[PDB]
Amino acid sequence: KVQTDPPSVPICDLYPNGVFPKGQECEYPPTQDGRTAAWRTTSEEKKALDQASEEIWNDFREAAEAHRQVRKYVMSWIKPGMTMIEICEKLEDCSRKLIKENGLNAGLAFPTGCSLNNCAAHYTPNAGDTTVLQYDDICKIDFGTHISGRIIDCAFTVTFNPKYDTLLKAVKDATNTGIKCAGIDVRLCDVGEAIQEVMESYEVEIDGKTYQVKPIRNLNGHSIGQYRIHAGKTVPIVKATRMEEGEVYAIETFGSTGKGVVHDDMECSHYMKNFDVGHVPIRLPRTKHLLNVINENFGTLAFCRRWLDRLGESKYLMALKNLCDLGIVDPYPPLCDIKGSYTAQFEHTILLRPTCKEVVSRGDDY
Template structure:
């Protein structure tokens, strides 16, 4: 397991350099996402989830759609959130850059320093609320707010969000870090400090194998599970493979209504604030492994 995580982390580190080079004015979000996801596969991994490119007040879960024409612009604050898995063992990581400007440097530094401060104290048996307290105090010391309703999370094999949340503030939880894999991801904002649903993302994950009456959609679902297990996947990943063979929109809506698929919402900052994010994945046993260090 640890060897698979290390391989995924090695790929993720290489990918970060490639991503930073692509984040420039005029580059399309679609091309960035497709290029990075292809590179992950070429390096021997698989995307742990669709590449998220969330800009300015968009907090999370924006991945380009088919024929998406959005492009990077000067002054954009870009959160680049991506994952790599090897045999289902997932590395989840993110960083923020401002394109050809320094207007939001302090806000970017707030989330980055919050993660750096967590690195100094994280250990087995630490209460998750203590991590949240460090994040909250660091971000507030810079004059900003954490996003209170976004959090890090435990990761298990093929399961990106595995139950235990790592808050971005002191929520007084007595849950302690046991041995396992955890993503810590401080979000900072100059807005209200809360994220809210904006629109649907085109990112899905399988949440149930509830019986499916339609045989064609049942076959489609079985192929989805074979390809992705419970790893999140994107509509655009399916488009080239299935469009014309099955009515993709009808099949997906059926599976959502039947309770087989969940579609993630795009999240925006409630007060229209700019949002920044940094994230790493820790493996914790008797030692601490910062998988992206």
């Protein structure tokens, strides 16, 4: 069984024995003392501890192969003139097929981010959004897949105008730097300091104006847990907590021509149940029904309004506002720098395995 063009064959059909391709395997970086952490690659104890969790790494790998094939497909057709809704639906239809969507066991980890220009993250169109992708737009495609709650958080920036090329190169270099510096027992702030140094070494010229690339300081990389996009540890992208063995990280960087700070803007599209909130009894009928729809379809995974619409739900905005006011659900509005600024993003999911560092979402693209 081989993949079609357009992709339609599920990843688990292409690998029937359930053994999926590994990502990029890296030896851990040397410590601040100078001594190499290379011993882990050949440690018999570490090898045994690594093989014990093979099923887990294997679920990330299936989700990462779906991610690579979905993004390669998106790159072949994404063009100015298409509406943001058309782009997100065409991407998500392919993603649902390749991951072989099956309730909470396999599916979409979070909505398709397609944030534009000064907006860096957490924009996906709601119903009725007539926004059209423009030739001069700088679009961040950030989408997620999962197998048994093992999440792939991976993102790239789309442009059609070469004026943004050095901005894209700066952010890609900063993300790859963050990835290289990551390792077991490495301080989170040391990863952030390395990201910042590389990012700010770039100067770009866009429409006769020059800027020194700034990392967005209130946007950061993070640890990932099962069914938990942000597991509590923060990887800053600027200058005490260490990365630990068996942890999973989203290493992401955002470069900006603006202030290098984002603020909540536009209408909200992204929502997610507070992971720590237990069962809450609700009697309000529309609010109770909506929370049941959320628990059944998303659990602790992120969702968007378009995903409620496709489930045949209507008249839910007040119900959704009630769940947000009660603190059961949290809204995640678009995060934007100043008007007229330009933002870029690159992101990979990395597995801190006992034997090596695996850039599980790495592809031949980025």
